[PDB]
Structure 1
Amino acid sequence: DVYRTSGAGGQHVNRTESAVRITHIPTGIVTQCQNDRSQHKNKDQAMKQMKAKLYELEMQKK
């Protein structure tokens, strides 16, 4: 899922920033990543947390 978010200002500006939202149906987990400022890399870092979060679910069931 790809959605936008607003930004800051100082006079009248309008800065919209994109955010990535990965959703895993088998687990219902939702991981977002606004760390970077590049759609691709944000998705990757999101997938970094996505895989890591899924990895933690393994350790609990373990």
Structure 2
Amino acid sequence: PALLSLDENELEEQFVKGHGPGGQATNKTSNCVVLKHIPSGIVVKCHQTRSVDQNRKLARKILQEKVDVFYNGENSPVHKEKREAAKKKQERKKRAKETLEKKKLLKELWESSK
């Protein structure tokens, strides 16, 4: 289930300062990308690194999850591995039932031994 790509064009990448979570480095740095999609309305920001060579290449990796919901919907590889990896949490809380039920069958048989 690959995530459908995005063209090299039609991506209005603005570069603003953004949020600043730091002293003086982060007020003056145009590190936040505002990588847009021109077709859909999907506006993505990023302040994930102090470097655009990992901001912009990771901002692209986020956008190709959001516009994937637009052209696929709730049946997409971005919701498949949301319903497959929270499938396990119904195989983790049901699993944990059947052993906390058999931990009283072995705890009441304990100490009712004589």
TM-score bracket, shorter-length normalisation:
0.7 to 0.9
Gaps in structure 2 of 5+ consecutive residues: 1-13, 76-114
Higher normalized contact order (CA 8 Å, seq sep 6+, divided by chain length): 1
How many residue pairs end up in the alignment? 58
TM superposition score normalised by structure 2: 0.44
Gaps in structure 1 of 5+ consecutive residues: none
Aligned ranges for residues 1-62 of structure 1 at < 5 Å? 1-5=14-18, 6-9=20-23, 14-15=24-25, 16-17=28-29, 18-60=31-73
Choose between structure 1 and 2: higher helix proportion: 1
TM superposition score normalised by structure 1: 0.73
Choose between structure 1 and 2: higher strand proportion: 1
Please identify runs of 4+ aligned residues in structure 1 that moved more than 4 A.
none
The percent of aligned pairs where both chains have the same amino acid is 26
